[PDB]
mmCIF file with all atom_site columns, C-alpha atoms and ligand atoms in Angstrom:
data_model
loop_
_atom_site.group_PDB
_atom_site.id
_atom_site.type_symbol
_atom_site.label_atom_id
_atom_site.label_alt_id
_atom_site.label_comp_id
_atom_site.label_asym_id
_atom_site.label_entity_id
_atom_site.label_seq_id
_atom_site.pdbx_PDB_ins_code
_atom_site.Cartn_x
_atom_site.Cartn_y
_atom_site.Cartn_z
_atom_site.occupancy
_atom_site.B_iso_or_equiv
_atom_site.pdbx_formal_charge
_atom_site.auth_seq_id
_atom_site.auth_comp_id
_atom_site.auth_asym_id
_atom_site.auth_atom_id
_atom_site.pdbx_PDB_model_num
ATOM   1  C CA . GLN Y 1 1  ? -158.558 -23.770 -12.975 1.00 0.00 ? 1   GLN Y CA 1
ATOM   2  C CA . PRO Y 1 2  ? -158.397 -21.665 -16.221 1.00 0.00 ? 2   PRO Y CA 1
ATOM   3  C CA . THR Y 1 3  ? -158.466 -18.476 -14.042 1.00 0.00 ? 3   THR Y CA 1
ATOM   4  C CA . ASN Y 1 4  ? -155.296 -19.415 -12.011 1.00 0.00 ? 4   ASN Y CA 1
ATOM   5  C CA . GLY Y 1 5  ? -152.302 -17.038 -11.697 1.00 0.00 ? 5   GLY Y CA 1
ATOM   6  C CA . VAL Y 1 6  ? -149.269 -17.961 -13.879 1.00 0.00 ? 6   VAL Y CA 1
ATOM   7  C CA . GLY Y 1 7  ? -147.253 -19.847 -11.202 1.00 0.00 ? 7   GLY Y CA 1
ATOM   8  C CA . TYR Y 1 8  ? -150.370 -21.915 -10.234 1.00 0.00 ? 8   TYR Y CA 1
ATOM   9  C CA . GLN Y 1 9  ? -151.292 -22.888 -13.851 1.00 0.00 ? 9   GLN Y CA 1
ATOM   10 C CA . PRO Y 1 10 ? -150.554 -26.478 -15.075 1.00 0.00 ? 10  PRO Y CA 1
ATOM   11 C CA . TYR Y 1 11 ? -147.493 -27.169 -17.244 1.00 0.00 ? 11  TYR Y CA 1
ATOM   12 C CA . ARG Y 1 12 ? -146.602 -30.271 -19.301 1.00 0.00 ? 12  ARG Y CA 1
ATOM   13 C CA . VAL Y 1 13 ? -143.069 -31.693 -18.946 1.00 0.00 ? 13  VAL Y CA 1
ATOM   14 C CA . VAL Y 1 14 ? -141.119 -34.039 -21.203 1.00 0.00 ? 14  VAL Y CA 1
ATOM   15 C CA . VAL Y 1 15 ? -137.635 -35.147 -20.160 1.00 0.00 ? 15  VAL Y CA 1
ATOM   16 C CA . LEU Y 1 16 ? -135.584 -36.806 -22.911 1.00 0.00 ? 16  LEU Y CA 1
ATOM   17 C CA . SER Y 1 17 ? -132.830 -38.996 -21.360 1.00 0.00 ? 17  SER Y CA 1
ATOM   18 C CA . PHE Y 1 18 ? -130.074 -40.223 -23.726 1.00 0.00 ? 18  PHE Y CA 1
ATOM   19 C CA . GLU Y 1 19 ? -128.637 -43.770 -23.625 1.00 0.00 ? 19  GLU Y CA 1
ATOM   20 C CA . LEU Y 1 20 ? -125.332 -42.472 -25.066 1.00 0.00 ? 20  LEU Y CA 1
ATOM   21 C CA . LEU Y 1 21 ? -122.980 -45.531 -25.025 1.00 0.00 ? 21  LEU Y CA 1
ATOM   22 C CA . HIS Y 1 22 ? -120.010 -47.169 -26.832 1.00 0.00 ? 22  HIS Y CA 1
ATOM   23 C CA . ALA Y 1 23 ? -122.659 -49.704 -28.029 1.00 0.00 ? 23  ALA Y CA 1
ATOM   24 C CA . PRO Y 1 24 ? -125.071 -50.258 -31.046 1.00 0.00 ? 24  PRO Y CA 1
ATOM   25 C CA . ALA Y 1 25 ? -126.947 -47.020 -31.859 1.00 0.00 ? 25  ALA Y CA 1
ATOM   26 C CA . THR Y 1 26 ? -130.727 -47.310 -32.613 1.00 0.00 ? 26  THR Y CA 1
ATOM   27 C CA . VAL Y 1 27 ? -131.867 -43.666 -32.385 1.00 0.00 ? 27  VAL Y CA 1
ATOM   28 C CA . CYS Y 1 28 ? -129.855 -41.515 -34.847 1.00 0.00 ? 28  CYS Y CA 1
ATOM   29 C CA . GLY Y 1 29 ? -130.215 -38.004 -36.317 1.00 0.00 ? 29  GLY Y CA 1
ATOM   30 C CA . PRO Y 1 30 ? -130.943 -37.073 -39.988 1.00 0.00 ? 30  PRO Y CA 1
ATOM   31 C CA . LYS Y 1 31 ? -127.662 -38.136 -41.698 1.00 0.00 ? 31  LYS Y CA 1
ATOM   32 C CA . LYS Y 1 32 ? -126.641 -39.888 -44.987 1.00 0.00 ? 32  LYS Y CA 1
ATOM   33 C CA . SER Y 1 33 ? -123.969 -42.614 -45.231 1.00 0.00 ? 33  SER Y CA 1
ATOM   34 C CA . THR Y 1 34 ? -121.137 -42.576 -47.804 1.00 0.00 ? 34  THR Y CA 1
ATOM   35 C CA . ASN Y 1 35 ? -119.505 -45.610 -49.362 1.00 0.00 ? 35  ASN Y CA 1
ATOM   36 C CA . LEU Y 1 36 ? -116.612 -47.031 -47.238 1.00 0.00 ? 36  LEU Y CA 1
ATOM   37 C CA . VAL Y 1 37 ? -112.922 -46.304 -48.124 1.00 0.00 ? 37  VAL Y CA 1
ATOM   38 C CA . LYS Y 1 38 ? -109.906 -48.406 -46.988 1.00 0.00 ? 38  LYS Y CA 1
ATOM   39 C CA . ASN Y 1 39 ? -106.072 -48.157 -47.056 1.00 0.00 ? 39  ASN Y CA 1
ATOM   40 C CA . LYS Y 1 40 ? -106.214 -44.327 -47.661 1.00 0.00 ? 40  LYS Y CA 1
ATOM   41 C CA . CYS Y 1 41 ? -106.016 -41.289 -45.314 1.00 0.00 ? 41  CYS Y CA 1
ATOM   42 C CA . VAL Y 1 42 ? -109.649 -40.085 -44.768 1.00 0.00 ? 42  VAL Y CA 1
ATOM   43 C CA . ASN Y 1 43 ? -111.757 -37.974 -42.454 1.00 0.00 ? 43  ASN Y CA 1
ATOM   44 C CA . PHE Y 1 44 ? -114.463 -40.235 -40.894 1.00 0.00 ? 44  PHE Y CA 1
ATOM   45 C CA . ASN Y 1 45 ? -117.641 -40.384 -38.770 1.00 0.00 ? 45  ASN Y CA 1
ATOM   46 C CA . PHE Y 1 46 ? -119.115 -43.633 -37.323 1.00 0.00 ? 46  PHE Y CA 1
ATOM   47 C CA . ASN Y 1 47 ? -122.449 -43.027 -35.441 1.00 0.00 ? 47  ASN Y CA 1
ATOM   48 C CA . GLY Y 1 48 ? -120.991 -39.632 -34.234 1.00 0.00 ? 48  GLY Y CA 1
ATOM   49 C CA . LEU Y 1 49 ? -117.404 -40.873 -33.534 1.00 0.00 ? 49  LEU Y CA 1
ATOM   50 C CA . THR Y 1 50 ? -115.727 -38.172 -35.693 1.00 0.00 ? 50  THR Y CA 1
ATOM   51 C CA . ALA S 2 1  ? -125.026 -74.505 4.277   1.00 0.00 ? 1   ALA S CA 1
ATOM   52 C CA . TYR S 2 2  ? -121.983 -72.763 2.654   1.00 0.00 ? 2   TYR S CA 1
ATOM   53 C CA . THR S 2 3  ? -119.209 -72.801 -0.006  1.00 0.00 ? 3   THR S CA 1
ATOM   54 C CA . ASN S 2 4  ? -116.092 -70.702 -0.802  1.00 0.00 ? 4   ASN S CA 1
ATOM   55 C CA . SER S 2 5  ? -116.599 -68.526 -3.969  1.00 0.00 ? 5   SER S CA 1
ATOM   56 C CA . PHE S 2 6  ? -112.851 -68.608 -4.870  1.00 0.00 ? 6   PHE S CA 1
ATOM   57 C CA . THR S 2 7  ? -112.608 -66.392 -8.037  1.00 0.00 ? 7   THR S CA 1
ATOM   58 C CA . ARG S 2 8  ? -116.237 -66.665 -9.353  1.00 0.00 ? 8   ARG S CA 1
ATOM   59 C CA . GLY S 2 9  ? -118.416 -63.629 -10.144 1.00 0.00 ? 9   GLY S CA 1
ATOM   60 C CA . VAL S 2 10 ? -116.256 -61.216 -12.237 1.00 0.00 ? 10  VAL S CA 1
ATOM   61 C CA . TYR S 2 11 ? -117.950 -59.613 -15.295 1.00 0.00 ? 11  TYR S CA 1
ATOM   62 C CA . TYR S 2 12 ? -117.089 -57.363 -18.289 1.00 0.00 ? 12  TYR S CA 1
ATOM   63 C CA . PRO S 2 13 ? -117.343 -53.868 -16.659 1.00 0.00 ? 13  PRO S CA 1
ATOM   64 C CA . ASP S 2 14 ? -118.020 -51.939 -19.949 1.00 0.00 ? 14  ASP S CA 1
ATOM   65 C CA . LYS S 2 15 ? -118.834 -52.609 -23.658 1.00 0.00 ? 15  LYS S CA 1
ATOM   66 C CA . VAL S 2 16 ? -115.362 -51.599 -25.057 1.00 0.00 ? 16  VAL S CA 1
ATOM   67 C CA . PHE S 2 17 ? -112.859 -53.974 -26.718 1.00 0.00 ? 17  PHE S CA 1
ATOM   68 C CA . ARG S 2 18 ? -109.336 -53.996 -25.140 1.00 0.00 ? 18  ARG S CA 1
ATOM   69 C CA . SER S 2 19 ? -106.452 -56.476 -25.654 1.00 0.00 ? 19  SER S CA 1
ATOM   70 C CA . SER S 2 20 ? -102.990 -57.437 -24.314 1.00 0.00 ? 20  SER S CA 1
ATOM   71 C CA . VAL S 2 21 ? -103.498 -54.989 -21.379 1.00 0.00 ? 21  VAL S CA 1
ATOM   72 C CA . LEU S 2 22 ? -104.015 -54.671 -17.589 1.00 0.00 ? 22  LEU S CA 1
ATOM   73 C CA . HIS S 2 23 ? -106.974 -52.408 -16.648 1.00 0.00 ? 23  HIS S CA 1
ATOM   74 C CA . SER S 2 24 ? -108.310 -51.081 -13.287 1.00 0.00 ? 24  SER S CA 1
HETATM 75 C C1 . NAG K 3 .  ? -119.133 -69.546 6.102   1.00 0.00 ? 101 NAG K C1 1
HETATM 76 O O1 . NAG K 3 .  ? -119.725 -69.033 7.338   1.00 0.00 ? 101 NAG K O1 1
HETATM 77 C C2 . NAG K 3 .  ? -120.065 -70.086 8.322   1.00 0.00 ? 101 NAG K C2 1
HETATM 78 C C3 . NAG K 3 .  ? -120.785 -69.429 9.503   1.00 0.00 ? 101 NAG K C3 1
HETATM 79 O O2 . NAG K 3 .  ? -121.796 -68.554 8.978   1.00 0.00 ? 101 NAG K O2 1
HETATM 80 C C4 . NAG K 3 .  ? -118.761 -70.789 8.719   1.00 0.00 ? 101 NAG K C4 1
HETATM 81 O O3 . NAG K 3 .  ? -119.032 -71.841 9.670   1.00 0.00 ? 101 NAG K O3 1
HETATM 82 C C5 . NAG K 3 .  ? -118.091 -71.430 7.498   1.00 0.00 ? 101 NAG K C5 1
HETATM 83 O O4 . NAG K 3 .  ? -116.824 -71.984 7.945   1.00 0.00 ? 101 NAG K O4 1
HETATM 84 C C6 . NAG K 3 .  ? -117.868 -70.412 6.358   1.00 0.00 ? 101 NAG K C6 1
HETATM 85 N N1 . NAG K 3 .  ? -117.535 -71.099 5.104   1.00 0.00 ? 101 NAG K N1 1
HETATM 86 C C7 . NAG K 3 .  ? -116.375 -71.664 4.798   1.00 0.00 ? 101 NAG K C7 1
HETATM 87 C C8 . NAG K 3 .  ? -116.250 -72.188 3.359   1.00 0.00 ? 101 NAG K C8 1
HETATM 88 O O5 . NAG K 3 .  ? -115.477 -71.782 5.628   1.00 0.00 ? 101 NAG K O5 1
#
């Protein structure tokens, strides 16, 4: 009821569970790819594997 | 009715490539 005390009011819940695996990513964060480089010493990031 | 399974029923335990190695 709209008059309820704070503990007895309704609350919405969302739980976000992450399928974090060494497998093909399909949800990814806002990020831009570079071109690929080979046969040279580079810093790198593949899907979050820095 | 019955049969012996011998060495059936093993599977790839995780999605990681490994080679020339013994793993537990
Ligand atoms: C499997 O179990 C049965 C009794 O449940 C037994 O008679 C049989 O010998 C066993 N299977 C094999 C392949 O020996």
